[PDB]
Coordinates of N, CA and C and ligand atoms in Angstrom, one line a residue:
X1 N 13.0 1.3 -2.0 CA 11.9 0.7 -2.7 C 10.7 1.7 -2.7
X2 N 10.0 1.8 -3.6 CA 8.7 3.1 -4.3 C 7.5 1.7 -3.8
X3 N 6.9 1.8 -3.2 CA 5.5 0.6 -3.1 C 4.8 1.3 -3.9
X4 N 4.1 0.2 -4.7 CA 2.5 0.8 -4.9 C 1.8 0.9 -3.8
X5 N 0.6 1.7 -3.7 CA -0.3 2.0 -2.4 C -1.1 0.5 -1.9
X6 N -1.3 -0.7 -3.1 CA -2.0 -2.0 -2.4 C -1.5 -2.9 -2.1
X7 N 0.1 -2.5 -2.8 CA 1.3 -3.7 -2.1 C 1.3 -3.1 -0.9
X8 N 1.5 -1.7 -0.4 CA 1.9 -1.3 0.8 C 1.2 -1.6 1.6
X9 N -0.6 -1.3 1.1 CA -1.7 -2.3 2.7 C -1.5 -3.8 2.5
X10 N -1.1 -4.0 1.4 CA -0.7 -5.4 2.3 C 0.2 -6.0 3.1
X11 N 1.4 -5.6 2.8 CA 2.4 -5.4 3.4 C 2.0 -5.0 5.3
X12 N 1.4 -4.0 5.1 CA 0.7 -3.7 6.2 C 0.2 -4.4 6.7
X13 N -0.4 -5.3 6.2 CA -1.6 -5.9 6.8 C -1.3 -7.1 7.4
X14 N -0.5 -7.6 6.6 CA 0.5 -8.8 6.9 C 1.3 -8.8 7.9
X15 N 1.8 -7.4 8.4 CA 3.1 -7.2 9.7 C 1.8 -7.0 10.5
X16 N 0.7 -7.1 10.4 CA -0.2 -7.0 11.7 C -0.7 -5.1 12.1
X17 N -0.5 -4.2 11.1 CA -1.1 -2.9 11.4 C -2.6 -2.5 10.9
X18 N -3.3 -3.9 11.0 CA -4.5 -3.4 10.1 C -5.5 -3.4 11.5
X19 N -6.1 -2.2 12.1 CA -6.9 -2.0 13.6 C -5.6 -2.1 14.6
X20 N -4.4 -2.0 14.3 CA -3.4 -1.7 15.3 C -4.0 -0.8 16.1
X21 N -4.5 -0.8 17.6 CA -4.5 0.0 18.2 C -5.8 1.0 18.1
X22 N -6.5 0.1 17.1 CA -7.7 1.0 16.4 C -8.0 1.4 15.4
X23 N -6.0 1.7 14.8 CA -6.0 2.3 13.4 C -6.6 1.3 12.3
X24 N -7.7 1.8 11.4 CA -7.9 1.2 10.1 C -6.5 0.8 9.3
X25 N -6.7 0.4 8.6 CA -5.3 0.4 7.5 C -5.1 1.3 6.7
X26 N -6.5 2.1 6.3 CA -6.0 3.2 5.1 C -5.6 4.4 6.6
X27 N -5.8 4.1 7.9 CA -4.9 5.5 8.5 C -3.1 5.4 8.1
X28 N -2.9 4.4 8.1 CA -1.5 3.6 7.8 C -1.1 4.1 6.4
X29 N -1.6 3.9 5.9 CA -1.4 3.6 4.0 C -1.3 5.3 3.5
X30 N -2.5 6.1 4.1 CA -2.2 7.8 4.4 C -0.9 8.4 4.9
X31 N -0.5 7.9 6.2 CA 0.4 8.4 6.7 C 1.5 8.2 6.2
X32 N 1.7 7.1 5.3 CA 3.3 6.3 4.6 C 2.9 7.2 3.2
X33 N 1.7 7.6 2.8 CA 1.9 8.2 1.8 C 2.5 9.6 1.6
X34 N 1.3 10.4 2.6 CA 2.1 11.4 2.7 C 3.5 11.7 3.8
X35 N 3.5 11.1 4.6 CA 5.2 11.1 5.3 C 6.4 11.2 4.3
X36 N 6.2 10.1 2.9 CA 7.5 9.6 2.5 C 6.9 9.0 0.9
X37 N 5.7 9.5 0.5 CA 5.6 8.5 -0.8 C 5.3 7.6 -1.2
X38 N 5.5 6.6 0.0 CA 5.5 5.5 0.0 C 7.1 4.5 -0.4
X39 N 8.3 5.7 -0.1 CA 9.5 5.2 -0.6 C 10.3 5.2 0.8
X40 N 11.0 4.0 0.9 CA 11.3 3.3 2.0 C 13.0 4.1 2.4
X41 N 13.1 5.0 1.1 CA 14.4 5.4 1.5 C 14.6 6.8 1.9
X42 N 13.4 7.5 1.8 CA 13.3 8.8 2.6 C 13.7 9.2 3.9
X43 N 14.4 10.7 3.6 CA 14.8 10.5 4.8 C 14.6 12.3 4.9
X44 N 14.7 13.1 6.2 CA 14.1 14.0 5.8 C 15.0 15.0 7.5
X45 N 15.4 15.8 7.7 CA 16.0 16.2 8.5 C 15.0 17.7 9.3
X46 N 14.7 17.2 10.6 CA 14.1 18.5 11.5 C 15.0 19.3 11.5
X47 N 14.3 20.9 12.2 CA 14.8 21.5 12.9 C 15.7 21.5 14.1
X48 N 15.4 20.7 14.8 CA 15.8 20.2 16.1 C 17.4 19.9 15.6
X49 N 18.2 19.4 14.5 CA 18.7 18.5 14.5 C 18.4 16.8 14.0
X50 N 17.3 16.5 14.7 CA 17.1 15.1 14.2 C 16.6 14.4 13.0
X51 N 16.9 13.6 12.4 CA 16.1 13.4 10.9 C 15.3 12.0 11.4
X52 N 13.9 12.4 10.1 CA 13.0 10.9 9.6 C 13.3 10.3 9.0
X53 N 13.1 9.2 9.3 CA 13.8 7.7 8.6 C 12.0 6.8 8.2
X54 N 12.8 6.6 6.8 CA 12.2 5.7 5.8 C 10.4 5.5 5.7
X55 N 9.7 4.6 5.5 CA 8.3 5.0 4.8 C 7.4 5.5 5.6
X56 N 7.6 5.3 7.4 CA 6.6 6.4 8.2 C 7.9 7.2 8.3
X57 N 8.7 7.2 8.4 CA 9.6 9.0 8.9 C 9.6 8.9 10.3
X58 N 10.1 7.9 10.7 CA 10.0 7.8 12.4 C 11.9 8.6 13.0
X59 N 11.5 9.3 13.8 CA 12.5 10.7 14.2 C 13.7 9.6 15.1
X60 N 14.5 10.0 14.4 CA 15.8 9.4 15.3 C 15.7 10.6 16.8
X61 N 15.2 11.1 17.2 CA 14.7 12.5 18.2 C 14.3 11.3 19.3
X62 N 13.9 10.0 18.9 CA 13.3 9.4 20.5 C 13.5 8.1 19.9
X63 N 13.3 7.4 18.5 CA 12.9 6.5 18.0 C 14.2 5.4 17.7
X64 N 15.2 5.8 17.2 CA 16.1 5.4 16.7 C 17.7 5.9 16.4
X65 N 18.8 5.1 16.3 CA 20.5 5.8 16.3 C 20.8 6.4 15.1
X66 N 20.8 7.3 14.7 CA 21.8 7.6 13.3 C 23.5 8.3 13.9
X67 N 23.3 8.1 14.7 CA 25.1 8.8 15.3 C 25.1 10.1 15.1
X68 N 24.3 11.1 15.1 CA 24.2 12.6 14.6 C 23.4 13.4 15.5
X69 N 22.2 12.6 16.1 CA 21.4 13.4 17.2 C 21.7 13.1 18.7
X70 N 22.3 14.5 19.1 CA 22.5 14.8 20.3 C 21.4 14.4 21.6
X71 N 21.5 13.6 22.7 CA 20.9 14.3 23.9 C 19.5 13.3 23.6
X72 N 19.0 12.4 22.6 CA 18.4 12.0 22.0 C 17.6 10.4 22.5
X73 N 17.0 9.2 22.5 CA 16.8 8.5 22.7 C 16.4 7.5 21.4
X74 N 17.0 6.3 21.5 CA 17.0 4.8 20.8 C 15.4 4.1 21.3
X75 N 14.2 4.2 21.2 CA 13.7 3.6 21.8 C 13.0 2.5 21.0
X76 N 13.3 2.2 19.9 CA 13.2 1.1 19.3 C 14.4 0.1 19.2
X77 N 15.2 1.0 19.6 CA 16.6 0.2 19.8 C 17.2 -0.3 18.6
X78 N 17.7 0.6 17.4 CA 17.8 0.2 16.3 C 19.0 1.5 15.8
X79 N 19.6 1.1 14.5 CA 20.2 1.9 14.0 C 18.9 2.6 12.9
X80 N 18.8 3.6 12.9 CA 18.1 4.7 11.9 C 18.0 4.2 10.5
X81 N 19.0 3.6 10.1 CA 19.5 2.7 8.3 C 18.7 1.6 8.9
X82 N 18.5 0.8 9.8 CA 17.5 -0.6 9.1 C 16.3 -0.2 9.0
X83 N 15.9 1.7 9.0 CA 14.3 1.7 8.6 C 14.3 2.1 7.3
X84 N 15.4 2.0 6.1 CA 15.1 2.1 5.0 C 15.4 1.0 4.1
X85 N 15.0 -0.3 4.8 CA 15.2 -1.2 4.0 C 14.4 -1.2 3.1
X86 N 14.2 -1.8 2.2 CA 13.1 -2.4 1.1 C 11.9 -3.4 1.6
X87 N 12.5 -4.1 2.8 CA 11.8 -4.9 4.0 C 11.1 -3.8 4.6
X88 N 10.1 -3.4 5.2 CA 9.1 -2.7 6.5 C 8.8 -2.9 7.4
X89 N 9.6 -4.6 8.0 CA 9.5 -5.2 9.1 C 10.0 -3.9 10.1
X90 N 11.5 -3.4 10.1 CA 11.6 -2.8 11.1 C 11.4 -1.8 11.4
X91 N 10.8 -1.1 10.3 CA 9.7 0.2 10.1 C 7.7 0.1 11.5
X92 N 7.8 -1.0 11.0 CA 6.4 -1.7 11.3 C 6.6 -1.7 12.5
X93 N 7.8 -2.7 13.3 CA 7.8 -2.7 14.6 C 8.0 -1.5 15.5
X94 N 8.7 -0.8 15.0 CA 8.8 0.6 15.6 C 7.5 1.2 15.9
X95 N 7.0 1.6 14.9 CA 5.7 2.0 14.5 C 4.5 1.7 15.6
X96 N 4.8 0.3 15.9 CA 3.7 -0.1 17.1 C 4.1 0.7 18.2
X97 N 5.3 0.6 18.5 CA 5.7 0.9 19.8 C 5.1 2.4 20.1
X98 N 5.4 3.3 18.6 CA 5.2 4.6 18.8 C 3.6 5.0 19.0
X99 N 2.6 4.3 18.3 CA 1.6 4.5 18.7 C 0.9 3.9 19.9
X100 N 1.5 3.5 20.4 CA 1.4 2.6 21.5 C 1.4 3.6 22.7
X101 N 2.2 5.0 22.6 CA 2.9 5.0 23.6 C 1.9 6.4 24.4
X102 N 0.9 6.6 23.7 CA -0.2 7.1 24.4 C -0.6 8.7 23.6
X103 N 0.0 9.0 22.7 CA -0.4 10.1 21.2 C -0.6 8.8 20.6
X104 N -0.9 8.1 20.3 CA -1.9 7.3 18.5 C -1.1 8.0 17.7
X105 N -1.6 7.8 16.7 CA -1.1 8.4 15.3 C -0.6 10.0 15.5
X106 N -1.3 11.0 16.7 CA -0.9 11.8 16.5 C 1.0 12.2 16.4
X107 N 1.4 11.4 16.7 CA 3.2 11.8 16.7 C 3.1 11.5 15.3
X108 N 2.6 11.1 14.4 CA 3.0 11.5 12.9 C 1.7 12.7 12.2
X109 N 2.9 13.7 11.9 CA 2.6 15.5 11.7 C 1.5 15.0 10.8
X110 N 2.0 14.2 9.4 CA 1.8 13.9 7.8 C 0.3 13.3 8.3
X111 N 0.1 12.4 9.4 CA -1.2 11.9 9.8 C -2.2 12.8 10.4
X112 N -1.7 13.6 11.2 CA -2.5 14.7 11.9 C -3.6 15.6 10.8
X113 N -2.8 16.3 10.5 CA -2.6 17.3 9.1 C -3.4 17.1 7.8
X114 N -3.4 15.7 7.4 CA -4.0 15.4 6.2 C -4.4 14.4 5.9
X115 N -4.5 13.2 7.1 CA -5.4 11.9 7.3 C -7.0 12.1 8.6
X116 N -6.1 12.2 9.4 CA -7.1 12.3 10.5 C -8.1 13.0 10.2
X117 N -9.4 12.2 10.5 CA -10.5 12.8 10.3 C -10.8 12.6 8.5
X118 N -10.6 12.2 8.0 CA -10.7 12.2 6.7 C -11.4 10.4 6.0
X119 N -11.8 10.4 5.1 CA -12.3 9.2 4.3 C -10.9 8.8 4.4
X120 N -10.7 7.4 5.1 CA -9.2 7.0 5.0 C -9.1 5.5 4.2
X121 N -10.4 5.4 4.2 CA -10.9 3.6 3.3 C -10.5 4.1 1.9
X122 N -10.5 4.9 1.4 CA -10.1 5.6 0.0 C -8.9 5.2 0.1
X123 N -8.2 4.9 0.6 CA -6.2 4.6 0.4 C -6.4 2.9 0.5
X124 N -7.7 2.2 0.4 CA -7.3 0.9 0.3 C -8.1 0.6 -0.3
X125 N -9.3 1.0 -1.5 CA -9.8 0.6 -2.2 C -9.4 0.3 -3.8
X126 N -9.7 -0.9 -3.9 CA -9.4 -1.6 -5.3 C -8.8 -2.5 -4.7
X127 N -7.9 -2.7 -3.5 CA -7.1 -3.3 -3.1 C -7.3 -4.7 -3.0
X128 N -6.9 -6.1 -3.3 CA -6.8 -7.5 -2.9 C -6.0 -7.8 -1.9
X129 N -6.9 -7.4 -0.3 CA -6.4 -7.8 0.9 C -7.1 -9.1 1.8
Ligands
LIG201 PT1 5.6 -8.6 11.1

């Protein structure tokens, strides 16, 4: 599934990531844009071996199973395919855990790089939230 950018903050906003942790919602709506488009079925393969899964690009490297990365950690405890559902529930849940875990948003590159520090209210304007 392709979101529009105001379905996506809502969506967002609804699974509870709006001041998650501090984050605004357009830091969210940024990072799902540029990570993945905003398309739930991206998937995008590191160096390391390990690939990003679906609209944040969360690394089966610590996050999640795809059966392919070595030496690796599940810590969402999930197969790698339920984060490209059309749903973002288990995209969302992950997501907490990872910013939670003491880097913020920095563990997403796409957020570092070209949100942070930036007008981020611009990714949710026009929006009906
Ligand atoms: Pt939720």
């Amino acid at each position: 599934k392709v979101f529009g950018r105001c379905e996506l903050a809502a969506a967002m906003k609804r699974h509870g990531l709006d001041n998650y942790r501090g984050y605004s919602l357009g830091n969210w709506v940024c990072a799902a844009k540029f990570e993945s488009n905003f398309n739930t079925q991206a998937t995008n393969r590191n160096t390391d071996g390990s690939t990003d899964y679906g609209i944040l690009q969360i690394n089966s490297r610590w996050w999640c199973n795809d059966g392919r990365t070595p030496g690796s950690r599940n810590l969402c405890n999930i197969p790698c395919s339920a984060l490209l559902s059309s749903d973002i529930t288990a995209s969302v849940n992950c997501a907490k855990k990872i910013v939670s875990d003491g880097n913020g948003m920095n563990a997403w590159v796409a957020w570092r790089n070209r949100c942070k520090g930036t007008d981020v209210q611009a990714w949710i304007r026009g929006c009906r939230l």
